[PDB]
Amino acid sequence: SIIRFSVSLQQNLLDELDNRIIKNGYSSRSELVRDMIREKLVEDNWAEDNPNDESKIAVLVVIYDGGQRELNQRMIDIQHASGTHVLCTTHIHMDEHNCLETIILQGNSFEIQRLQLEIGGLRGVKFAKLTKASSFEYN
Amino acid sequence: SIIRFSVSLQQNLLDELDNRIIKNGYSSRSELVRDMIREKLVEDNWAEDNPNDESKIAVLVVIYDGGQRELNQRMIDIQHASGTHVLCTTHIHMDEHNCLETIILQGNSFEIQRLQLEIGGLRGVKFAKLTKAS
Ligand code: NI
Numbered sequence: 001s002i003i004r005f006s007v008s009l010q011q012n013l014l015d016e017l018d019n020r021i022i023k024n025g026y027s028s029r030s031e032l033v034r035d036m037i038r039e040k041l042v043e044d045n046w047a048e049d050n051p052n053d054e055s056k057i058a059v060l061v062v063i064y065d066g067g068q069r070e071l072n073q074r075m076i077d078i079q080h081a082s083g084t085h086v087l088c089t090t091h092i093h094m095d096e097h098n099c100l101e102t103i104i105l106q107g108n109s110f111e112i113q114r115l116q117l118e119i120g121g122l123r124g125v126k127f128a129k130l131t132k133a134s135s136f137e138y139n
Numbered sequence: 140s141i142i143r144f145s146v147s148l149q150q151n152l153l154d155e156l157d158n159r160i161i162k163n164g165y166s167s168r169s170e171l172v173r174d175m176i177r178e179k180l181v182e183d184n185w186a187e188d189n190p191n192d193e194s195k196i197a198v199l200v201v202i203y204d205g206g207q208r209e210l211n212q213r214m215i216d217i218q219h220a221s222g223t224h225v226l227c228t229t230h231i232h233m234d235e236h237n238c239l240e241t242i243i244l245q246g247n248s249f250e251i252q253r254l255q256l257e258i259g260g261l262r263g264v265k266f267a268k269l270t271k272a273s
């Protein structure tokens with residue numbers, strides 16, 4: 001249940017990929033490609049069909065100035081308006097002007113990606129990255 | 140010239156690859172993977188960056204089979220053994236079988252990479268996706 005298949009490609013592309021792995025942490029080529037395939041297949045899945053589907057899972061990671069007035073509440077307001085469901089939030093108080101949150105979200109692809117974009121655009125948000133999951137990965 | 144190299148995919152990923160080939164009009168697994176590689180190579184800065192000794196904050200998102208006996212213990216063993224400083228780990232249940240955990244941690248590129256790969260390799264772990272800051 002862990003299959004091998006061969007990929008054909010011109011030696012120049014393989015080396016291009018190999019050159020790029022020399023400066024990369026990636027333990028191995030197969031591992032890099034496997035993870036690229038996963039990432040791309042998830043992206044493709046998130047790009048399609050129904051806005052009726054309210055069942056994608058994702059995690060939004062944010063670093064922001066929790067000392068800034070209105071900022072936390074603006075994030076809450078945006079999440080409330082998005083239609084997404086927050087399953088759980090973990091918050092670390094890093095210092096006077098930095099908080100890290102991991103926000104576990106469920107909802108449709110649109111609602112979730114829009115939440116990331118809106119939050120990432122706020123003054124005082126220093127970092128906002130979404131981790132996507134697709135059902136083929138866990139069902 | 141034309142070379143072949145081998146790729147090892149879990150069955151669930153391979154089935155999705157096959158479905159995507161059909162949905163998007165590709166002619167072979169080789170063609171789709173080749174095109175994926177071209178797109179990746181277009182990007183300048185990959186996630187595994189250029190590793191160094193600087194401390195960074197990171198988040199690992201893990202989905203795993205909660206019904207796999209002793210799997211959580213294996214994850215605890217890895218996290219306690221890690222050279223990283225794990226700040227906290229939060230678990231929820233997604234459905235009857237799958238659980239999702241987030242691990243918030245601090246460490247260098249090498250230490251964070253080791254943690255991700257070790258957890259990702261466990262039977263019952265569906266994936267371990269890394270987010271690094273700085
Ligand atoms: Ni805080």
Ligand code: NI
Nearest residue numbers: 205206232238
């Ligand atoms: Ni349980």
